[PDB]
A paper describes a structure:
Analysis of human sera indicates that the majority of neutralizing antibodies elicited by natural RSV infection target the prefusion form of the F glycoprotein, which is metastable and transitions to a more stable postfusion form. These mutations introduce covalent linkages or steric hindrance that prevent structural rearrangements required for the transition from prefusion to postfusion.
To provide structural and immunogenic bases of F subtype differences, we crystallized and determined the structure of a soluble prefusion RSV F from subtype B strain B18537, stabilized by DS-Cav1 mutations. Crystallization trials of the DS-Cav1-stabilized strain B18537 F glycoprotein yielded crystals of symmetrical cubes of 50 to 80 μm in size, at pH 5.5 in space group P4132 with 1 protomer per asymmetric unit. The F glycoprotein formed a homotrimer, each protomer comprising 2 different subunits, F2 and F1. Residues 26 to 106 of the F2 subunit as well as residues 137 to 509 of the F1 subunit were well defined by the experimental electron density. Each protomer comprised 4 major structural domains, the membrane proximal α10 helix, the DI domain including the F2 N-terminus, the DII domain (residues 401-463), and the membrane distal DIII domain (residues 49-308) including the F2 C-terminus. The S155C and S290C mutations formed a prefusion-stabilizing disulfide bond. The Cav1 mutations S190F and V207L stabilized intra-protomer interactions. The prefusion-specific antigenic site Ø, which is located at the apex of the F glycoprotein, differed between B18537 and A2 in 5 of the 22 residues of this antigenic site, and structural alignment analysis indicated an RMSD of 2.2 Å in this region. Thus, antigenic differences were minor between strains B18537 and A2 F glycoproteins, except at antigenic site Ø, where residues of higher entropy clustered and substantial differences in affinity were observed for several of the antibodies that target this site.
Author numbering:
A (entry chain F), B (entry chain F), C (entry chain F): 26 to 106, 137 to 509
Amino acid sequence: QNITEEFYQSTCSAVSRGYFSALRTGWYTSVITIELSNIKETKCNGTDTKVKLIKQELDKYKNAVTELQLLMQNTPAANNRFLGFLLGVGSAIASGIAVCKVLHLEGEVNKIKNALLSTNKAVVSLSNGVSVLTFKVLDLKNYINNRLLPILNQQSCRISNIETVIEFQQMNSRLLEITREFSVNAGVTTPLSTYMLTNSELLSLINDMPITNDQKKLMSSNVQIVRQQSYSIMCIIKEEVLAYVVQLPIYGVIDTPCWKLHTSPLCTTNIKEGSNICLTRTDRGWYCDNAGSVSFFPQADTCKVQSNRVFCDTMNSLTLPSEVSLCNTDIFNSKYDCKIMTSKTDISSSVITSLGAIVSCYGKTKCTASNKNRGIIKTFSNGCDYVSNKGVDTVSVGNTLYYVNKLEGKNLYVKGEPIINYYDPLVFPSDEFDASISQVNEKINQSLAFIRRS
Amino acid sequence: QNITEEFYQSTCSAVSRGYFSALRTGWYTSVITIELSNIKETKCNGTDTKVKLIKQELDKYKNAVTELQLLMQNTPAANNRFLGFLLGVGSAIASGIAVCKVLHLEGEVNKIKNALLSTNKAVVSLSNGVSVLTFKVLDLKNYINNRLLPILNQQSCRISNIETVIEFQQMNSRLLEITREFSVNAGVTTPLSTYMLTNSELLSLINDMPITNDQKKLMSSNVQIVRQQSYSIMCIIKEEVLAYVVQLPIYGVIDTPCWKLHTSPLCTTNIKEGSNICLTRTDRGWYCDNAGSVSFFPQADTCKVQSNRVFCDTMNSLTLPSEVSLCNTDIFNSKYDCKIMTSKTDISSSVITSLGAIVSCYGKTKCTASNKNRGIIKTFSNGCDYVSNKGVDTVSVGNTLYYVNKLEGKNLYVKGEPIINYYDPLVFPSDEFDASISQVNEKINQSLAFIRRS
Amino acid sequence: QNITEEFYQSTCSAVSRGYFSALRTGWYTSVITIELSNIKETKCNGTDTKVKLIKQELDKYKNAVTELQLLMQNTPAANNRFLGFLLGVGSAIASGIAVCKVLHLEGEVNKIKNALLSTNKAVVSLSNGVSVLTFKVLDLKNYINNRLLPILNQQSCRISNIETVIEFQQMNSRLLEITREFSVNAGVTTPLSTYMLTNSELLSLINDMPITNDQKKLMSSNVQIVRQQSYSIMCIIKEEVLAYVVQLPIYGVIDTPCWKLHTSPLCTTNIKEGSNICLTRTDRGWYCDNAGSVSFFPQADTCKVQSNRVFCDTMNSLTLPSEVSLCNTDIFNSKYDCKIMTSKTDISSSVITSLGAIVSCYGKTKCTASNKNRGIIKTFSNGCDYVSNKGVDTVSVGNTLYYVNKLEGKNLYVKGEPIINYYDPLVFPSDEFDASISQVNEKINQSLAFIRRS
Ligand SMILES: *[C@@H]1O[C@H](CO)[C@@H](O)[C@H](O)[C@H]1NC(C)=O
Ligand SMILES: *[C@@H]1O[C@H](CO)[C@@H](O)[C@H](O)[C@H]1NC(C)=O
Ligand SMILES: *[C@@H]1O[C@H](CO)[C@@H](O)[C@H](O)[C@H]1NC(C)=O
């Protein structure tokens, strides 16, 4: 957890480095099953409370099976996924859906049923060429047919004991909650709950997945994050089996360097009303080296940071050439056309970084950094400035209070003239929402083609 | 499920056709009731476990009623709802809220109470002129007053049986979960859960709704989607009645043609850095014919597709003239000013379509389509291109893998010169976020007014 | 609830006034504890159902503790937060996280354990200088060790009674649900559920908070809204204690004037295709006076309105000078550069306001306001227009139906020439996504510098 952060005064941006990747590139699919009983009506006509109680619970079981059948008519299941508007589009659950489709082919559910006759965990080779870990997590068929129905049948049906009511409730419990979870999510859930897959089942699954021991260690040390990036997909009710697919991430990029880019608006600071111009670097977000290029995540919130490990889904990334990082040290470089937006919107704001805070202070806004016991320790002047988190608790910009992160690291302030000062405001192309350094230079040049004749 | 898709090479867009609409235009409101008991304290002072267990459960009932009362002080309930930023604004639950308001008028709850004295389902004519289907789904008044309180009262209060504890838990159960659901959603829930309305209640409701048998068949064949587009709204606790309103969709547009427009960026492909220009059709999303015009849904994710049926809420649409579809076959037509955005952002990306994939490949990005067993079957060259899903499993653009849909349909590739090539890059108005063909032509012409004197 | 609304025909905007603020400026943190038992294995080897039932429930307890331990390895917990893209960035849960960190220091959990030995509620002075209200809401240590384990131990372990199974289920219940809630939210939940903190605990907490009696009255009269703006943060499992932090809002701005600005597009109405220009005021949202300036909430949906009280979080605001409100009465004023976007997008739409509706009607769109019993009572002509909610039930724009709010107030229609008519369309800078009155004037002037030589 050796984090280093550099602030660039010239471009009102800061880069936090020292992070290591865990990027999801693949999917592991597993089939989870519950064995069901094919009983729709019992010939018990008693009146006492125990009788009604078993009937109520059997009604709950039967209405769960029916709800799961109505989830099946809304199948295929549905799910999908500053510069976020450019992201590509595809379904996040295509892999799971392909496995569900295979489970509909004659014999396939029966093959899984036979693999789990004598064990609750087995690898099965499906017809489409995937080997999947399959589980039987609950056997309501044996419980209803062999432990409950003999009580209700071979004797007067009122002769049960209140313990069997309570046991049947406990056996039905996990089925009703899986059904509930699927019913309010249209058969596709994320994060993966402990009712879809318990911790012991999930850790067992990870341990038997066709991945390296390092990947197994990563996933087992970060179970919650694995759950947040996993899906459960309702598949089929068929031949007295309920089957659903769990889709777990495979982190095909691990331990490459990652860095987070924070950006804020950089405006001129004249007092005259509406006389100021602005630019903001629009390439903020997470960056991870990946296979000769760089995976860029423009909605930074899509990545989950655990200490110095950054977990992201590659479906939330744009693939950029590695020269994009030159924008941090030389925004005018000729190898990559660095992205900016221009405006005359000089509204104050702050960004809390990994190890400090950037503050864009304009007009009359009060912008300060404080220590809870000592008072104000820094006051920001008009323009874009930075403070490390050392000795600081909070940053106030106008009426809003922000808390800095408490992590201790290394901070570097790179001094430089704000680049907004290099532009002639009479010819600056303001109000460009998605622009770049070259486009702006090109426009300035063109509109200095009139001033030529002068 | 006869889907047809056409790709237009000239404009980097594809249209999937063969879909049929189901658009929500109206709302059906129903009042769901639970009968409650007005008991706040029992004079039972025993010490054994059964006693405490009944007291705990009565405390749960009483705290549910209190939580429902605090939901009532946060009433009226609150809910609402590329070109999505233009959508109009209004409340999705105004109809339900109007019914809740009527339930507060003297006598109204009593009228419903009297309609349900002898039946659990009845149509009631409210004072505001709406006839609503009303339900009594749980009678905790009769259970507490007539089956539970005689046990706790007319005898020593320790003489209960553990069955009555379990029965009281089961009777209280649905009340506690409805209360829980409302409590973490500020009294307004969507999707409609099976605790708000069970499958049998919902199917009963649909069957008695004042709609045609075709609408009843649609809704009954697509219960999950109906639930996703329905609301439950907490209304009142009054005169020993809990009442909430369920608001179900009415699909007033059915079986008209719908088509989905996919678009991707179309840039020039010079090697020179920052020398390329781009345009993207901004009118992507779902389109359905509707009442002489066309309902356009710019956040395509707002529509739920079930096979070839497309379910959408008209509140998520813009109403356009039917000439908008000319943009697909003739983007330069003079009847509708086709919408585009311009830029110099030549970042690679892909869109998975209904029957294939569009790929915008720029710079050095590796863009390919593969079959899992055969390897790469297509490589995309710089520019905008398309592949059908026939014989294809996946599309890779840089570091991101996408899965194509597996549905088989008809695919047409319409060859044509990319229209970005028609523009002189020295005068192209780049970086226009919300533009159109005419605005761009108008700007080019103006800025060719200087080159005149030359 | 004296609301007044003014519509400005000149700028296609309306301002609803008469509201009073409740802005969250601070956070109150409280530590909630559950006492746990350190038992992982019982030497009971029986076979009957009661035995298994206790073992199942003990397994549930133990798997809850383990799940809470895996939530701890994904700690620090994670949470954060038209002109919304300008908002600053920081963590909403920094205060709670600082308290969690302190609970990890030697002796700190023990200090809380000793403060709650004889009471379930006490104020405790933590090592970092915060006094926190701490609660013990469940004592599973005493229940397992002193009421359950003697039954399973000092006698044959099959001698329990089914009541103790049911009592143990009821005692374990709240622990399992808190664990479930944390497990699918990565240890950070909002809204604050009744399992994290019951109504009686929450009202007790408010009553003992170091705030004024007016703040206590506000919070106690609006519990649901307090819950929606609160967080629960999983902290630690240590020394047989589960501890989590609840973070409640402190409304440091109360009863200052608030007003809501509604805006819609204002376009010219020529029949000629693609010949029209448009502008829209981009400063729509909620505004509250606050400390000499004005807190502006651009994603209006971030504020919760209860009658005439407006509850917002200052982290969702931009701090503006109070001259921003001049844009409502004089959009050309020289004290504040009023914000607009320009385009040629003349697509029809509506905004339902507090007391009426704005309608932007263009092209051939049918735009009307109706009364359910009387029919159409107003038809909107091309351009931007307004109707109050008096005698109106609904507004239709094309294919979409909107319901007006039913609240009765005062409505003022300020007549004035649409300002879009003042611009020469040949020189209007269209397609500016984030602009202002001055930038537009400046551009018009420059591009009238060519027409000079003429
Ligand atoms: C931490 O990492 C930075 C960057 O690699 C390096 O400069 C520094 O020497 C490292 N220090 C320690 C103590 O690991
Ligand atoms: C499918 O629909 C398309 C478009 O209407 C039509 O061209 C084609 O003939 C149809 N084919 C079948 C087999 O239905
Ligand atoms: C309501 O408030 C408005 C604005 O302050 C004021 O003009 C009016 O006189 C008030 N009327 C009543 C009845 O409170």
